[PDB]
């Protein structure tokens, strides 16, 4: 383990994080929106699951045009969630339970309702004009409408610019129309961002930050028209000019130094960057401890599988190997370095992992949910569990498009309508995809009980902010799963206990090697830690599947799996349907 600097322990390397989506976790006052008192009341549940830390999605004052990711004030809790004091009390309660607390740092962009933008947009001459990206129209079209400065596509569809009538210029918004991008080229802007979004929260005791689209802060000068890579789209991905831009490391080093100098009590701060995509070299530049940038990052290749590179909402075929390789992108690069990795399958931007990567049928949803838990329990990196993942939550079914809340759905729908027609092949493909891929599959209220109609998320008379998934009626809820010894919840409790007990090789294991990489059913690998060897054999299929242990002898003992502990023949070399096994040799 000496030629493996990545094995140096840190609280944040071996912490299991639980991600809370505040709108959808727990309502304490029957207004249909989750809130901080709700979260506080459920911290014991999170601790009992086995979590070491929580990440709460944005709870700051926000119009909710992107459900919190459009922030109007970094220093004020959205009143519907509570007061600032409620938040400080929540941080303290988390701490007093022996858990760490990270907050979501959303500083590529802010709300157009933020005072910075209200000032910026007020004239062309004000001190904050250049805190955002303002450009004149490229020209005017044949109908007299202003043409945006370039061809860039919003992450939510359509143009990445919005026209301001008052000042007669467009402003850049990679996200929704009310999320203007902050101009990191402006040093005064960067310093104000650090003070408000970072310093305030450090002063109030956070243990770290999850950094929203942290790879987007550096725009290539001139904001040039992007390559026309999609021949059936008006607008084009800005990635070459916005993703991992030339100043991105400079900016992350500066922010890291700010954090180091602002902390008052010497505590260890974790940063996890949602960096989206990066070469292995770029990943190392971000997460090498000696670089003083990020602690770790999320890379999205494993959650991209089965979606077109040109458009997330066009489905494409994939095979198990594609997912194996994409998952391994998270962690293989750290081998023999001072870098660190993340491990996750779900977040508030993703559909449910059982639906995507298991089998959500009534027959297989439990066993395949447990299989995914076996996989994640054994992988190197900081593990994240998303609210409801531990219950084996699945995608919702048969929802009409108008039922979806997500601005990502609404804006993409409207762009397709405009470009291709509502009754088009392009629309049909989109509607097919949303049923599998929409962020909204993550966002239906948390299911605490079988109680009609709100599943214990709120009282029975409340109208939830977003519809319940019918799955609560099918036993996917906290109360029913606690009482079922065979539940996905009780299994996740076991998986986290197993991971912690064997943390040297589960959390810090190295020299990851695939076994039978091409296999369309078997996901198998080994890892090392000094004298120890971990071997995984995981059957992602309803068919029985054979496996071999490389250098198989007598030392390989079965330490964890999803089939009944007393019924499994450890010497057998065929996995049952959806069976997973972790063997450890010493
Ligand atoms: O902040 C803009 C977007 O950034 C990331 O994708 C966030 O995780 C997502 O929820 C948000 O819509
Ligand atoms: Ca509420």
Curated annotation (Swiss-Prot):
The active site is at 212 (nucleophile), 274 (proton donor). Changing residue 212 to A: Abolishes catalytic activity. It is found in: Mitochondrion. InterPro entries: Glyco_hydro_13_cat_dom (IPR006047), Glyco_hydro_b (IPR013780), Glycoside_hydrolase_SF (IPR017853), O16G_dom_2 (IPR045857). Induction: Expression is increased in response to the addition of maltose, isomaltose, and alpha-methylglucopyranoside. Its EC number is 3.2.1.10. Major isomaltase (alpha-1,6-glucosidase) required for isomaltose utilization. Preferentially hydrolyzes isomaltose, palatinose, and methyl-alpha-glucoside, with little activity towards isomaltotriose or longer oligosaccharides. Does not hydrolyze maltose. The keyword tRNA-binding does not apply. This is Oligo-1,6-glucosidase IMA1. GO terms for cellular component: mitochondrion. It catalyses: Hydrolysis of (1->6)-alpha-D-glucosidic linkages in some oligosaccharides produced from starch and glycogen by alpha-amylase, and in isomaltose. Belongs to the glycosyl hydrolase 13 family. Present with 752 molecules/cell in log phase SD medium. CDD domains: AmyAc_SI_OligoGlu_DGase. It is an enzyme of class 3 (hydrolase). Keywords: Glycosidase, Hydrolase, Maltose metabolism, Mitochondrion. Pfam families: Alpha-amylase. GO terms for molecular function: alpha-1,4-glucosidase activity; alpha-amylase activity; glucan 1,4-alpha-maltotriohydrolase activity; oligo-1,6-glucosidase activity; sucrose alpha-glucosidase activity. Gene3D superfamilies: Glycosidases (3.20.20.80), Golgi alpha-mannosidase II (2.60.40.1180), Oligo-1,6-glucosidase, Domain 2 (3.90.400.10). It comes from Saccharomyces cerevisiae (strain ATCC 204508 / S288c) (Baker's yeast). Its main location: mitochondrion. The keyword Iron does not apply.
